[PDB]
């Protein structure tokens, strides 16, 4: 009738990415947009808006039936999983995300590393001169786990389509690993890896069997 399906997993970054944060106050040792961190401490974190804005775009191009143009108005078979401000059949999003915090600090200081974010030197070639615009970026370190929990809940009517919903979510998790997740990922910066993909219940109203 009403269950709470939580998809607890650990995001393992096999390649350092780069996501532009807010202003430059926590990392002013760069020339472009730095990576957002924590305003209290000093741990590189990733917001939850980047997980929904990227997974929905890469998923609405294979499970669609019409050429899209504007958000919240393409492929009704998957619009009920994110959100829609036009259809009356559904409004709320049944896939609550969470800001993935870096929980790898419990064993990172024992090995002795540099810090938390490195600086990479990049430039461009105008095919008429040598080095042009000596800029630089700020990527993330390698091997850093995170806490990603996907909340799923039914609303009574969710009855004769629960088994079909797991096919889209499971296919969307493995599809994100084969694509970059960040900025300027065309050269190979993103590419995540969902480690220990498991699902459990909190309220207790639906048995677990479709674990993998």
């Amino acid at each position: 009738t009403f269950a709470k399906i939580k998809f607890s997993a650990q995001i393992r970054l096999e390649t350092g990415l780069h996501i532009g944060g807010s202003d430059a106050f926590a990392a002013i040792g760069a020339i472009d947009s730095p990576v957002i961190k924590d305003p209290i401490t000093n741990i590189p974190i990733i917001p939850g808006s980047s997980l929904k804005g990227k997974m929905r775009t890469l998923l609405a191009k294979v499970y669609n039936e019409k050429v899209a143009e504007k958000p919240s108005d393409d492929s009704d078979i998957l619009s009920r999983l994110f959100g829609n401000s036009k259809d009356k059949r559904f409004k709320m999003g049944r896939l609550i995300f969470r800001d993935a915090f870096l929980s790898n600090a419990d064993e990172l200081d024992s090995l002795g590393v540099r810090s938390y974010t490195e600086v990479k030197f990049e430039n461009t070639i105008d095919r008429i001169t040598a080095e042009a615009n000596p800029r630089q970026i700020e990527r993330a370190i390698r091997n850093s786990t995170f806490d990603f929990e996907l909340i799923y809940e039914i609303t009574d009517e969710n009855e004769n389509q629960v088994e079909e919903d797991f096919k889209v979510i499971r296919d969307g998790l493995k599809l994100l690993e084969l694509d970059y997740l960040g900025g300027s990922g065309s050269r190979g910066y993103g590419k995540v890896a969902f480690e220990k993909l498991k699902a459990t219940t909190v309220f207790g109203n639906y048995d677990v069997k479709t674990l993998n």
Binding site: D23, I28, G29, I31, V119
Partner: protein
């Protein structure tokens, strides 16, 4: 007609002092002033009051109930060797400064007080009495004109004192003494008429503390709330162009309260003590007639503001009776003078929390609207109209038309032509044509030079616009390739305000230092610097000042000139106050195309965060750079930030690969203390080895100065983070 003669009789009561100080003649100022005024003007009642100003004259009485008998009591209220400094009698005894009677003009440079003039007296000047006699040819003073002379009397005589004698009475200028003495004269006429008797206007106050002990005055004040919540707070970023018109909307609203209240009761402009920023101090009388007027006025002024506006804008009055014996003669205790303001400011905090009452609060909770169309500017749905991409309502609709009306020199107050600001009044922007011109016109920064037959009751307010608002991103970057496409916002606000107004002038038991005139000249001396001198100092810059008041300002624009204006404006304030009043602010950059709500709110949180230490602190780009401001222009901006501009500019591209790492070392100091010191010795050798051999002669002292600034003081370590950050933002991209 009968009561208006008393107002003009107290303004020119010392008109003969200017001629005496300019032309050598052994005559009194009260005797030569009546003869010089009668030569060009054909009057008689106002001429007898000039001769009967003092008490040792009596030209054969001539008059039983004449109005020339109450001018001596009101003269001692506003009263108590070139020109004594106002800020000199505040705090301790420092340096003795003196002004200079020049010409007050917006384009002219300010004459700061110093100790290099003539400590003797004035001399033989002719640049003051010449302009007075030139425009003296005016028709009979009637009701058609009110502020046709007060706007010029205080625009040239602002640097001329009144009655040069001793030291207690010398810091009061003649332009303010003659203006303040007319307010107390009108209260006596209203007190002697509301009661019943009339033969008292002669000679019955034999006792020194007779009329001075009886309470016959009233101190009125208000607190217009909703200034920072209506101007700074905004919805979308499309209201950036009309933000200057939004600031001028509430600026004339506070001036309309002073005009509608004094004209309805039957007074003039003398009953005014600095109106601006939602704070003023009105003077009245202790009569039952003046009380019934302010009660009905506050109930009707808040009536029309409930339909168009909401609960943001609210005006709460505050009265407080007092006596005239609290600012003269006996009673030298500081609590005696402070009790006058406590009788009116106490109800201010009580009336603002007790706004509406019965049969008023339930009107807003009725409900009758059912539509989904808002202006997305101020969150209000009331009489909308089409415009551009959105549908503007009616509250923020008049700001678009008024934004283009800023270039107009005159502001005609109409009835229903545009956007109404009062009960049955309005305001528009047009000039050089005069399509109607109802009554009471207002202009902006109109001093001397430009003066003719205008006749307008105006005030002073800052107004300066560079090039729009939403385009300072391109002006911050030069043509070569330096700077960023961002902008900064500073909010310079005065720190201490309870002193130099309540009880702070006490230093000697001789002088009382509690006269209302001594406390009234403090607001007038600082209003010329925070509301008039701002437009002159912001010239030739890539910024535009907005809301130039005596409290908090709002300067927006490119940071290429704001940084050079914030630290420079405080330097002119220290010399004007002899270093007795501190100042604090905060400069913070933001992004382009951002909502002004959080853009003006995040820069305001740094103001409160810059007061945790004591009072003379500062907050830079973030809340971590907590310094003392004085250590910036004398150390950081002096021999730190400037030294890098000519001792490191020769190294480019390859040489600019070490500043980004040295900043990170300055932060990691608590967990890495001694280990970080050993790593600093390695970065100082990588820059010297990776350069030209002939260029090494320039890099010879920066290594020792940078290492000493790291192990000396905890507060000194944060100074290097600010110098290395301003250098990267200079030349980049």
């Amino acid at each position: 007609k009968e009561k208006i003669d008393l107002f003009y009789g107290a303004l020119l009561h010392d008109i003969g002092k200017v001629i005496q100080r300019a032309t050598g003649e052994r005559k009194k100022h009260a005797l030569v002033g009546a003869d010089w005024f009668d030569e060009i003007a054909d009057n008689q009642v106002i001429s007898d009051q000039i001769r009967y100003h003092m008490a040792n004259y009596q030209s054969d009485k001539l008059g039983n109930d004449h109005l020339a008998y109450i001018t001596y009591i009101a003269d001692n209220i506003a009263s108590g060797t070139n020109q004594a400094d106002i800020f000199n009698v505040f705090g301790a005894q420092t340096d003795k400064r003196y002004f200079k009677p020049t010409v007050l003009n917006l384009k002219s440079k300010p004459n700061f007080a110093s100790a290099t003039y003539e400590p003797f007296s004035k001399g033989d000047y002719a640049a003051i009495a010449t302009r007075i006699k030139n425009e003296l040819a005016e028709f009979e003073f009637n009701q058609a004109q009110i502020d046709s002379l007060l706007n010029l009397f205080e625009a040239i005589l602002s640097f001329v004192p009144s009655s040069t004698n001793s030291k207690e009475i010398a810091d009061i200028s003649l332009a303010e003494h003659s203006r303040l003495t007319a307010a107390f004269a009108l209260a006596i006429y209203d007190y002697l008429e509301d009661k019943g008797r009339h033969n008292y206007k002669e000679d019955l106050f034999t006792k020194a503390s007779a009329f001075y002990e009886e309470e016959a005055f009233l101190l009125a004040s208000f607190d217009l709330s909703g200034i920072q919540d209506f101007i700074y707070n905004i919805a979308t970023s499309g209201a950036a162009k009309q933000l200057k018109a939004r600031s001028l909307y509430l600026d004339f609203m506070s001036e309309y309260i002073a005009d509608s209240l004094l004209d309805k009761l039957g007074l003039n402009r003398a009953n005014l003590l600095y109106v601006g920023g939602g704070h003023a101090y009105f003077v009245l009388a202790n009569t039952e007639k003046t009380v019934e007027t302010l009660v009905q006025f506050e109930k009707d002024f808040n009536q029309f503001l409930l339909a168009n506006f909401q609960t943001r804008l609210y005006v709460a009055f505050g009265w407080g009776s007092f006596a005239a014996k609290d600012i003269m003669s006996e009673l030298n205790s500081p609590e005696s003078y402070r009790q006058i303001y406590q009788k009116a400011s106490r109800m201010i905090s009580e009336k603002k929390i007790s706004r509406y009452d019965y049969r008023t609060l339930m009107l807003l909770n009725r409900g009758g609207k059912s539509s989904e169309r808002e202006c997305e500017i101020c969150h209000s749905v009331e009489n909308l109209v089409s415009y551009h991409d959105q549908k503007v309502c009616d509250i923020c609709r008049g700001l678009y038309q008024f934004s283009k009306e800023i270039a107009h020199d005159h502001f005609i107050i109409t009835e229903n032509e545009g956007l109404p600001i009062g009960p049955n009044a309005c305001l528009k922007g047009v000039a050089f044509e005069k399509l109607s011109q109802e009554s009471f016109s207002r202009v902006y920064v109109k001093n001397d030079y430009k003066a003719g037959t205008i006749k307008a009751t105006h005030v002073f307010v800052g107004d300066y616009q560079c090039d729009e608002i939403h385009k300072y991103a391109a002006l911050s970057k030069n043509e070569d390739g330096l700077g960023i496409k961002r902008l900064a916002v500073v909010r310079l606000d005065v720190d201490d305000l309870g002193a130099a107004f309540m009880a702070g002038f006490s230093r000697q038991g001789n002088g009382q230092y509690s006269t209302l005139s001594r406390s009234a000249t403090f607001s007038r001396s600082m209003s010329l610097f925070f509301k008039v001198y701002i437009n002159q100092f912001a010239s030739d810059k890539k910024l535009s000042i907005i809301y130039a008041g005596g409290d908090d300002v709002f300067a927006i624009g490119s940071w290429q000139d704001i940084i050079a204006f914030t630290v420079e404006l405080r330097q002119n304030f220290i010399k004007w106050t002899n270093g007795k009043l501190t100042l604090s602010a905060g400069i913070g950059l933001f992004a382009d195309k951002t909502p002004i709500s959080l853009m003006a709110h995040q820069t305001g949180e740094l103001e409160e965060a810059a007061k945790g230490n004591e009072k003379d602190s500062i907050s830079l780009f973030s809340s971590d750079y907590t310094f003392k401001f004085d250590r910036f222009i004398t150390n950081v901006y002096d021999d730190k930030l400037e030294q890098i501009r000519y001792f490191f500019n020769h190294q480019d591209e390859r040489g600019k690969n070490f500043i980004y790492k040295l900043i990170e070392l300055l932060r990691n100091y608590e967990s890495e203390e001694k280990m970080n010191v050993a790593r600093l010795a390695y970065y100082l050798t990588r820059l010297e080895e990776l350069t030209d051999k002939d260029e090494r002669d320039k890099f010879k002292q920066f290594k020792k100065l940078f290492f000493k600034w790291y192990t000396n003081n905890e507060s000194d370590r944060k100074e290097a983070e600010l110098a290395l950050l301003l250098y990267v933002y200079e030349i980049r991209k």
